[PDB]
Design a protein around this motif. Structure first.
Motif: not given
Ligand SMILES: [Zn+2]
Lengths: 122, 61, 325, 313
Positions: C183, C186, C198, C200-201
């Motif tokens: 990504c 991040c 992703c 995460h974000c």
């Molecule tokens: Zn991300």
RNA sequence: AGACUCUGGCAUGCUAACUAGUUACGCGACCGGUCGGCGUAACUUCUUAGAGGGACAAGUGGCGUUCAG
């Protein structure tokens, strides 16, 4: 063919939901306990209910269902839900950040942050 | 020449009125020559036929 | 010789090769393929189900989140990794294997991520698929214990430890060439190739990056130094007002948004296979299109159908008489 | 010390629910089943089969839940789901007397070394005292059990004649004859109870059920002693007359315990088929220890009696 | 509509039946047997008419979005 009745289903769900502990996989045992739990007029209906219970428990002991609430899996679910780890996932040692982001931070008074690592888009 | 047969698979019902059964025929001549034929009457998987002409092949495509 | 789900899936009959054939009871029950389960029902039984100690499972996961593979892994995946680690500790010396991996070396090139290198048929300037080459097509091929992992996320962690592992082939695997997604917001890598947002974000910002893992335990990533990849072209475009109901198809923006169920009928999503033994008797050469059902009139389409149509930027010009479903 | 399968017994259609072994004869063994039939087995112990059925006691209109023998190998007694308590003659293969009184499923039946002491335990929530001739001595109603009476046994001892009754109401209740007074309440169970078994010495009782934990109590003291954990649900509980060994029938397998050190002895299971992976293995409902001290008699859901023999080494 | 109720299939288990029947036992007739000849101890197999059971997709295998089926 053959299809389950609404009444049979609902009653079965009630019986499982309240008294899961008493029931098993033996059809006959499940029938008899059902007969001793709920106010059932008809024998056929009772039998149907028992069958539904039996099937349900065959299914349920493999994995949890979409419909009802079990008096053990409520506790288990709660335990799984109110979980927290030892160290918070946001409390990280080094966080990777864009140059633009860094610039923004600087333009907010937070140029004196220590945990940032400004990675360049290579 | 008269050749004997096997039934590998019973496929479906052909014919106008649904009288003919479309059947996969293995040969009893050791060869794995699988010719699809049409039969009249009741045929289950594992039947052995007596075909008058073996050169014939029934409605494929 | 610890078997993953891929070993049975690819029908790796290496029951003659190893003697330490051990597997998880979960990974063999998770397979939904009938032919592999048929294979399970026949095969010479020398396999033995084993479940490892929680001390070893804790130790695998300890650095699995350090190498950046733990989100890409599964629960059952960690179980196989732990099985191998505790089996190596049982027979062979534990001191061979390192705790905490190495710092990854960044080495950028000007090639586009979509270049068909490492695709067996494709050839640049002879690289041929032959009736001899077919069994040879595996990966990068070069004593007592090992693995049968086809998943790269598995292979990554295994080779970072220094656990000598292998594939469907007889000999040990040395270098592991594959792609992973990074990504560009991040910078959090995932080995899961299928995903598009992703973990995460959550944005649609994952981009393909090629990686190589040696048996020594070293990692290097080839980033694309190509402006075509990180270009802000067809990204800002005005979106329709969010409609609810049974028929409303939303533009798909998060990994976990609830779509209304719109499936294709079984008449529609039947592809014609010509290699069926009883195919020739069936009246027409192709399986009939569906035109009668509601799914056809609502224009419900498969996920694979209309793929390149999505890749075009919405601020462009479609032909004067077409509408994009 | 190891346990090995000597032979297999086939003859029942429904599940083998209770096996009763006689001390007088080490050659004829009785087995109750769900197919409404109690079979007397003539043992031959050949390589072909361990035992051939000799008489089939047909008479009951429902599942025969509990069968019990006599002090002498000439009288049998069975309690079936239809509310019928039937006294059998093993010589003739015919009923002698029929004990009628219960309205619900008669679950368990108790028999003394004295012989003229019969106690039936039913889902009727009632304990009933019976004569050999058919006379009801005393009906128990005053705080018997809140739910179904699961299993009832006596104390084979020269001391105080004590009856032990466990129920589905999560309590083990201890009664004494001639007064019919509640002597000891034993509280310490999760889930319903299934089986109760009293020591051959006449000092200890073992109770189990849903929790998978065999709870050992004392008869003379009225005190907690041991807690023996297991994998799955407990169906049956058993004692050895010579070895001081608590054999408990768990889920699909049987688990043997040595109480002197709280140690496992052996787990007993035979299944090779991995093809039926999504299917549950046949449970072991009945368990009985033979008079020999080497032979075990185990009744299953697979409607099949399996015998286990001791091979030292 | 389904559900409810009845009905039918099943019981060598149960409740009974001097307007049902059997078995055994006496007497008689006939050549150790045959008798819809006649007379009360056996209780239900047949006959009857009731209660209670008993089947619920229960179980296994296959197919199934692994659920409804
Ligand atoms: Zn991300």
């Amino acid at each position: 063919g053959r299809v389950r009745t609404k009444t049979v289903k609902k009653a079965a769900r009630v019986i499982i939901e309240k008294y899961y502990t008493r029931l098993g996989n033996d059809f006959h045992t499940n029938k008899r306990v059902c007969e001793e739990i709920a106010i059932i007029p008809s024998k056929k209906l009772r039998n149907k209910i028992a069958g539904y219970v039996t099937h349900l428990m065959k299914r349920i002991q493999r994995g949890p269902v979409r419909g009802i609430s079990i008096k053990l899996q409520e506790e288990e679910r709660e335990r799984r839900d109110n979980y927290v780890p030892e160290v918070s996932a946001l409390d990280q040692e080094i966080i990777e950040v864009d140059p633009d982001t860094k610039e923004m931070l600087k333009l907010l008074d937070f140029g004196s942050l220590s945990n940032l690592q400004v990675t360049q888009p290579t | 020449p008269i050749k004997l047969a096997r039934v590998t698979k019973v496929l479906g019902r052909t014919g106008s009125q649904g009288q003919c059964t479309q059947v996969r025929v293995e040969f009893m001549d050791d060869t794995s020559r699988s010719i699809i034929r049409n039969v009249k009457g009741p045929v289950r998987e594992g039947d052995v036929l007596t075909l008058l002409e073996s050169e014939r092949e029934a409605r494929r495509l | 010789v610890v078997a993953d789900a891929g070993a049975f899936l690819r029908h790796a009959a290496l029951q003659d090769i190893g003697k330490n054939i051990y597997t998880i009871r979960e990974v063999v029950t998770e397979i939904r393929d009938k032919a592999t389960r048929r294979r399970l029902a026949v095969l010479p039984y020398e396999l033995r189900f084993k479940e490892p100690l929680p001390e070893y499972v804790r130790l695998v996961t300890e650095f699995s989140k350090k190498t950046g593979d733990y989100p890409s892994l599964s629960a059952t995946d960690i179980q196989v990794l732990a099985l191998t680690y505790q089996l190596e500790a049982e027979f062979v010396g534990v001191s061979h294997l390192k705790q905490e991996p190495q710092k990854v070396k960044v080495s950028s090139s000007i090639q586009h991520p979509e270049t068909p290198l490492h695709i067996s048929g494709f050839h640049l300037p002879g690289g041929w698929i032959t009736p001899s080459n077919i069994k040879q097509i595996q990966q990068e091929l070069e004593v007592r214990v090992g693995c049968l992992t086809t998943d790269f996320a598995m292979q990554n962690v295994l080779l970072q430890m220094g656990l000598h592992v292998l594939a469907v082939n007889g000999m040990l695997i040395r270098e592991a060439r594959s792609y992973i997604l990074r990504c560009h917001g991040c910078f959090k890598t995932t080995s899961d190739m299928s995903r598009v947002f992703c973990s995460h974000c959550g944005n649609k910002t994952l981009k393909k990056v090629s990686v190589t893992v040696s048996d020594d335990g070293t990692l290097h990533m080839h980033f694309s130094r190509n402006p075509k990849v990180l270009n802000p072209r067809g990204l800002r475009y005005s979106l329709p007002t969010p409609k609810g109901g049974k028929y409303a198809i939303n533009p798909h923006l998060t990994e976990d948004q609830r779509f209304p169920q719109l499936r294709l009928s079984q008449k529609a999503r039947q592809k014609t296979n010509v290699f069926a033994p009883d195919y020739i008797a069936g009246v027409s050469p192709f399986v009939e299109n569906d035109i009668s059902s509601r799914s056809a009139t609502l224009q419900v389409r498969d996920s694979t159908l209309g793929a390149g149509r999505r890749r075009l930027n919405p601020n462009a010009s479609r032909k004067k008489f077409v509408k994009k479903r | 010390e190891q346990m090995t399968l000597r032979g297999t017994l086939k003859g029942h259609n429904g599940w083998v629910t209770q096996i009763a072994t006689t001390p007088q004869f080490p050659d004829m063994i009785l087995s109750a089943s769900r197919d409404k039939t109690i079979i007397m087995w003539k043992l031959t112990r050949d390589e072909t089969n361990y035992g051939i059925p000799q008489r089939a006691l047909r008479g009951h209109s429902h599942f025969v839940s509990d069968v019990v023998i006599s002090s002498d190998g000439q009288f049998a007694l069975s309690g079936s789901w239809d509310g019928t308590l039937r006294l059998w003659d093993l010589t003739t293969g015919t009923t002698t007397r029929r004990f009628v009184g219960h309205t619900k499923d008669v679950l368990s039946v108790a028999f003394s070394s004295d012989n003229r002491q019969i106690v039936s335990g039913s889902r009727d929530k009632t304990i009933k005292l019976w004569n050999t001739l058919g006379v009801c001595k005393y009906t128990v109603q005053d705080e018997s059990h809140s739910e179904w009476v699961s299993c009832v046994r006596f104390s084979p001892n020269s001391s105080n004649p004590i009856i032990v009754s466990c129920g589905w109401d999560k309590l083990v209740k201890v009664w004494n004859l001639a007064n019919c007074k509640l002597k000891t309440n034993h509280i310490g169970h999760t889930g319903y109870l299934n089986t109760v078994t009293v020591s051959p010495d006449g000092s200890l009782c073992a109770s189990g059920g849903k929790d998978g934990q065999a709870m050992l109590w004392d008869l003379n003291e009225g005190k907690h002693l041991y807690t023996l954990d297991g994998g799955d649900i407990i169906n049956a509980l058993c004692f050895s007359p010579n070895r001081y060994w608590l054999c408990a029938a768990t889920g699909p397998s049987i688990k043997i315990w040595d109480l002197e050190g709280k140690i496992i002895v052996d787990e007993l299971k035979q299944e090779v088929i991995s093809t039926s992976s999504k299917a549950e293995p046949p449970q072991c409902t009945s368990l009985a220890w033979s008079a020999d001290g080497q032979t075990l008699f185990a009744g299953y859901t697979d409607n099949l009696v399996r015998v286990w023999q001791v091979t030292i080494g």
